[PDB]
Structure 1
Amino acid sequence: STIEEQAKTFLDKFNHEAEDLFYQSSLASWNYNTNITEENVQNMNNAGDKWSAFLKEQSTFAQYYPLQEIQNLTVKLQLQALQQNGSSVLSEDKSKRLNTILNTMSTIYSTGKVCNPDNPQECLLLEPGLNEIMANSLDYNERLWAWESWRSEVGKQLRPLYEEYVVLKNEMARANHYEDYGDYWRGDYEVNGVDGYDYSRGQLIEDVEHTFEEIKPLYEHLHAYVRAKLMNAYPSYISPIGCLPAHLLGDMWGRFWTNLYSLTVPFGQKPNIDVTDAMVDQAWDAQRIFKEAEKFFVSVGLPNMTYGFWENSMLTDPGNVQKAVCHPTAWDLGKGDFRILMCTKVTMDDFLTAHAEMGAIQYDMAYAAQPFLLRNGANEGFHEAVGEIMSLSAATPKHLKSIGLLSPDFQEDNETEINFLLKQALTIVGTLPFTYMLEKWRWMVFKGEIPKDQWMKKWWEMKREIVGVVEPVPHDETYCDPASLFHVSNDYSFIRYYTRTLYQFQFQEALCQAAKHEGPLHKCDISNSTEAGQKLFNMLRLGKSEPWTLALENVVGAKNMNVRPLLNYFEPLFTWLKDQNKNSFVGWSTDWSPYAD
């Protein structure tokens, strides 16, 4: 019995027993979400405790098999994922500490309550309500209160708890043999043992840094153009050279500038490309939205969402009776079960979000015929990029004609493309500085470059410099603004939200070439192109069996992250934005302040 043949029969036992265990724990995790209840939360913990406990024993047995003297490449990768020590190294209740503080963080957001001073009854959560203030209100005073009170009341509360979060999770450092908690999340991109393709964790920094510099030209001009529109709609508050205030951006944090499309509309007399005003006039419920999404991909080639999807998914808000997490989540349970949980709304954003999550489902479906561990896409950015590759096609003005939202006229004017591109830039271009900034400060925290006595404050200097956004009110370190966002509170990577972005244009370029599109990339619908769909499914199935740097090359010529497709997609917008912003100042001052007055 060769050691690899012993390794396969061990792995063969794992894939059978683990799939049911993962399904059982994931089934309770769905129920916890659907019917938030002390009993359901406990069911997730006890069943989830078994999944973790099951993982630890198989992990110890996997170490007995050496990572050497095995040759089938899938066998090596499968063994590494199991052989990782994991969160077991922390001694007993110390791990339970990490469980409790993290378990607290899911609750603090769900229970995070800001209360109106005028009416002490009237307290709000980060339900759609608070986010709706940031999305629609045009009052500087109103937005600031929701911006401030949230992290005044709830942020500070999480500051000691996020303080121990790093302290206790960086205990893993040199226990799990990674140097800092930033090194662990970067291990997702790591590929080793492949000649000519070995990608080290440090390469990801240098790559991100270089591509971001080429992103800066387009972003600064967008930042300038947005400032001019904002200064008219907000006299006095905004200085023509100063950093943009955070609350007047779309979200509670400013992650997506797509909310400001109404204020920042280039032309506005031509037909609207934001078709939420048409969806309400086209009476499209959530079932219609997803049914049109299901129809999009079956046109490409993937068959229908399994009936277990439509039967067991939650695509509508429960109502008052049931309290559930409303965040878009492309759940995948294994054992042939695929569901989507997403409180859905009558908005183009929710129309475009649904198309991305279903593309992620069909990703989760395409590589089902793989060993258990290799079924998670080849890196984190892939899973999040596949859906947006389709989403870029979904919003295209030509495809919006076929859906029935834009009228049959289709004015293909030189202006409508810019209207469409700027809505796309706000959603796509704006989030990349915010992403790099957040994760840069996150990585630097794990390394220890910023002590707690310099925390928070540094965050704001970095946010002023990189993203060009200023704080309305100065914050002591008792404030904890970074952990006002779900991705930071629930210990989820956020740079995975930027690798996908450079990726999402890398692939579409090749998919349009596969469809033999005659023209630019923003004119590209993957619809009715069986060949481009076969190209995706051919490499969706690979999962993590083939290194990402290899799977990238097979689809698109590049073996690594390249910003060049993104620039080409935005090149018409970049040239126009330069001409308009010739008088206004491009750039910002790191020293301006809305409170220094």
Structure 2
Amino acid sequence: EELAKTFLDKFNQEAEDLDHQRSLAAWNYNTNITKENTEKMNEAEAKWSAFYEEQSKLAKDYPLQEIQNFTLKRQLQALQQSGSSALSANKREQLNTILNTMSTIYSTGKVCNPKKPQECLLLEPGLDEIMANSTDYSERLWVWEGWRSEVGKQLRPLYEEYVVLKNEMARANNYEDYGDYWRGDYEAEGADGYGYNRNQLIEDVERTFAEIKPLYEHLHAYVRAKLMNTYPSYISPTGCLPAHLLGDMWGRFWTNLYSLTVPFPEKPNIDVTDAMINQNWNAVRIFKEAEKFFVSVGLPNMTQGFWENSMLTEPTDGRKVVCHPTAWDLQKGDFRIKMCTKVTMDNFLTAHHEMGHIQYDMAYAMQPYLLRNGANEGFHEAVGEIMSLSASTPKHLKSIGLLPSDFREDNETEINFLLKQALTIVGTLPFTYMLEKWRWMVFKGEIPKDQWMKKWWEMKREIVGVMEPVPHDETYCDPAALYHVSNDFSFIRYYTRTIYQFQFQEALCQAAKHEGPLHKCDISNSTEAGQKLLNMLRLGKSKPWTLALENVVGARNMDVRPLLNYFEPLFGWLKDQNRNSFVGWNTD
């Protein structure tokens, strides 16, 4: 019969044993960047790739349509379909050389002050600051145009080669293109009303986006109004936002426009970061607090190894380290978080997010290795933000921590809070959907390489209401200058994550019997809501996500309504501010 199972246990045990060794090699790099430590990663990164190619091919020996137990079939299909880069010897290694070269050209980017040529700066510490802190248009323009000039253009020939070999690889695995391969993540077979085809996704993305667009349009016109105060004569009242003038290096989040857009300046601010400095909070205590949050809903504490093996403080060893936050599942009950956590409110909030991922890793280790993952790529980020929704409410900040508890929480601070939320969450939705709609089109061939930038900026102008300072011909590769694009990461997950968040937090809060506005809901102290979430995490990828969603929110696809409900008060407010102005944007 199905000897596949007796094959799988063999894979399950050889997988974790080496992936354990891969993870350890990678972690020793990220916390201690050496020539020796970089090299050892490649050896383990080499062995793992070699290991998969044989299992992928060996998996193909077993036919997926003889397998009846859907849980066993699901793992088999992942092994024979995914990672099955049986492409060609000279192309499994050309692709890898392309994938390192793009990854490291981005990592090693340095652009120079056009007026101070010997002053050149990396993105990861430095240029990011200008783009989060500056209001000097010309200053932002060169940092923006420079990165897109210096690193983007070098990445353009690589992206083109990247495209062909990836499309080839995905063709070999019975996929229309790499985009199809990527969307495949949301595919799920149950043949019982829980089935989901890849080509439902673009329909469901464009369906929900249509519901989000009003809200975004109003958040856009409001943010445009307050920004003409800072840049009169560069922002037209009727047109697009310049791309270099948003929260960060791309328009990815609008968070750092809050200073500029806060509805009610004269309300005392809500930023708890000074209170921690006053109170001598340090990295450890922030996580001890996030631990209390999870414990309080009935999730486990952290592991002892998490404390001893994690990196919370950026080292003063002179040890050079990648400070970008991540949550590591190293396969052996060894969970760690890698974060240069400074004593702020925003870090406090992310430490809740990133410990969200650790909980989800801990929650599904009862699964065979091939099923230790989130039900789709959207589920892990949704699970970490669910945490920040509750821990950022004023109700939470009072109770455990240092909002003063003499704090007035009225309609004016609530609008202040929602606007802060929308800038980061609702702002990112157009930016993210427009990016995957480019890539999907590029992989599908709907955009010739002779019109990549021509059709990128056009799409930016049409969908994000964002436009570019300087005109870009086909020598630039602007999308390549975001990390996920040049590091070959699927991106629509940050969209689907966003809709999931509010589906969860609504149903979860209803289990916590919270009454009133969904956005003042804090789940803390609710073992009832924790158990509701803990059930689905445990499932991992072992059931179709459509079934996993319903076991929490009682729905089987993206519903935008909770997100609309969550921001309902900010919607009415924004529509009043814009009431006798233009809502939308010109495309000239």
The two structures, once aligned, show a CA RMSD in angstroms of 1.4
Matches within 5 A, 1:205-354: 205-319=202-316, 321-354=318-351
Aligned twin of 2:549: 552
Per the TM alignment, residue 106 of structure 1 is displaced from its structure 2 partner at its CA by 2.1
- Distance between the aligned counterparts of 2:276 and 2:120, measured in 1? 31
In the TM superposition, residue 534 of structure 1 has moved relative to its aligned partner by 0.8
Change (3 A) 1:237 1:96: same
Tell me the equivalent position of 1:524.
521
Aligned to 1:384: 381
The answer to whether the 8 A contact 1:315-1:344 is kept is yes
Question: CA separation in 2, counterparts of 1:356 and 1:194?
Answer: 35
SS in 1 for 2:260: coil
Cα displacement string for residues 289-344 of structure 1 (whole angstroms, at most 9, x for unaligned residues): 22221221111112221111111111222347222222221121111111111222
Q: Which residue of structure 2 lines up, in the alignment, with residue 35 of structure 1?
A: 32
Is residue 113–residue 142 contact of structure 2 (8 Å, CA) maintained in 1?
no
* TM-score normalised to structure 1 length: 0.96
* Contact 1:384-1:500 within 8 A present in 2 as well: yes
Aligned mates of 2:462, 2:37 — CA distance in 1: 44
2:201 to 186, 200, 204: 204
Farther-moved stretch of structure 1 (465-474 vs 395-404): 395-404
* Distance (Å, rounded) in 2 between the aligned partners of 1:543 and 1:472: 45
Residue segments in structure 1 that go unaligned for 5+ positions in a row: 592-597
C-alpha deviations, 1:426-456, integer Å up to 9, x for none? 1110000000001100100000111111011
1:126-525 to 2 correspondences below 5 Å: 126-319=123-316, 321-525=318-522
3-state DSSP of counterpart to 2:162: helix
CA contact (8 A) 1:352 1:394 kept: yes
1:481, 1:500 → 2: CA distance?
24
Whether contact under 8 Å (1:363, 1:386) holds in the other structure is yes
- The 3-state SS of whatever aligns with 1:330 is strand
Distance in 2, Cα, partners of 1:88 & 1:200: 23
Deviates more, 1:411-420 or 1:6-15: 6-15
Given residue 319 of structure 2, which amino acid in structure 1 is its aligned partner? Q
Work out whether 1:574 is the aligned partner of 2:565.
no
In structure 1, how many angstroms separate the alpha carbons of the residues matched to 2:279 and 2:140?
Answer: 31
Contact 2:52/2:83 (CA < 8 Å) preserved in 1?
no
Contact 1:367 1:541 in 2 (8 A): yes
Aligned AA for 2:531? Q
Q: Which residue of 2 aligns with 1:92?
A: 89
Please tell me whether the aligned partners of residues 263 and 416 of structure 2 are also in contact (alpha carbons under 8 angstroms): yes
Do 2:53 and 2:84's aligned partners in 1 also have CA atoms closer than 8 Å? no
Count of residues in correspondence between the two structures: 588
| 2:529 corresponds to 1:535 | no
Alpha-carbon displacement from aligned partner over 1:474-520 (angstroms, at most 9, x marks no partner): 11111111111111011001100010100000011111110111212
Shift of 1:39: 2.2
CA contact (8 A) 2:360 2:383 kept: yes
Please say which of residues 309-318 and 134-143 is displaced more in the overlay: 309-318
Q: CA deviation at 1:63?
A: 1.9
- What is the CA distance between 1:582 and its match in structure 2? 0.8
Q: Equivalents in 2 of 1:38, 1:179: separation in Å?
A: 40
| Alignment correspondent of 1:595 | none
Asked if 2 retains the 8 angstrom alpha-carbon contact of 1:273 and 1:419, the reply is no
Change (3 A) 1:145 1:410: same
The CA distance in 1 between the partners of 2:373 and 2:146, in whole Å, is: 39
Residue identity (%): 85
> Counterpart amino acid of 1:338?
F
Q: CA deviation at 1:50?
A: 1.2
Are 1:511 and 1:532, in contact at CA under 8 Å, matched by a contact in 2? yes
CA 1:347–1:163 in structure 2 vs 1: closer, same or farther (change >3 Å)? Answer: farther
Secondary structure, aligned partner of 2:396: helix
Which residue identity is paired with 2:475? T
The 3-state SS of whatever aligns with 1:141 is helix
SS at match of 2:587: coil
- Structure 1 distance, partners of 2:450, 2:66, is 49
The residue matched to 2:152 in structure 1 has which SS? helix
Amino acid at match of 2:409: E
1: CA distance between counterparts of 2:504 and 2:75?
Answer: 27
The TM-score normalised by the length of structure 2 is 0.97
The Cα of 1:257 is off from its aligned counterpart by 0.7
Partner of 1:76: 73
SS in 1 for 2:542: coil
Structure 1 residue corresponding to 2:52, chosen from 30, 52, 55: 55
Question: Cα offset for 1:119?
Answer: 3.6
Work out the CA distance in 1 between the residues paired with 2:277 and 2:586.
Answer: 42
Q: Which has the higher mean CA deviation after the structures are superposed, 188-197 or 353-362?
A: 188-197
The runs of 5 or more residues in structure 2 that have no matched partner are: none
After TM superposition, give the deviation of residue 254 of structure 1 in Å. 1.4
Q: Could you say which residue in structure 2 is the equivalent of 1:589?
A: 586
Please give the secondary structure, in 1, of the residue aligned with 2:121.
strand
Equivalent position amino acid for 1:189 in 2: Y
CA–CA distance in 2 between the matches of 1:456 and 1:403? 49
CA distance in 2, matches of 1:320, 1:437: 42
Pick which of 77-86 and 180-189 moved more: 77-86
In the alignment, the residues of structure 2 paired with residue 336 and residue 250 of structure 1 have an alpha-carbon distance, to the nearest angstrom, of 38
Alpha-carbon distance change, 277 to 422 in structure 1, aligned in 2, over 3 angstroms: farther
How far 1:284 moved relative to its partner? 3.0
Q: 2:250 is paired with a residue of what secondary structure?
A: coil
Distance between the aligned counterparts of 1:74 and 1:529, measured in 2? 32
Match of 1:26 among 17, 23, 28: 23
CA distance, structure 1, for counterparts of residue 570 and residue 275 of structure 2: 25
After superposition, the C-alpha distances for 1:115-140 in whole angstroms (9 at most, x for unaligned) are: 22444432100122111101111111
Name the CA shift for 1:277/1:451 in 2 (closer, same or farther; >3 Å).
Answer: farther
Q: 3-state SS of the aligned residue for 1:340?
A: strand
Between the aligned partners of 1:444 and 1:281, the Cα distance in structure 2 is: 52
| Partner Cα separation in structure 2 for residue 347 and residue 392 of structure 1 | 17
Given residue 234 of structure 1, which amino acid in structure 2 is its aligned partner?
Answer: Y
CA distance in 1, matches of 2:137, 2:165: 39
Range moving further from structure 2, 234-243 or 53-62 = 53-62
- Report which stretch shifted further, 327-336 or 522-531: 327-336
CA distance in 2, matches of 1:425, 1:204: 24
Compared with structure 1, are the counterparts of its residues 483 and 319 closer, same or farther at alpha carbon in structure 2 (3 Å cutoff)?
farther
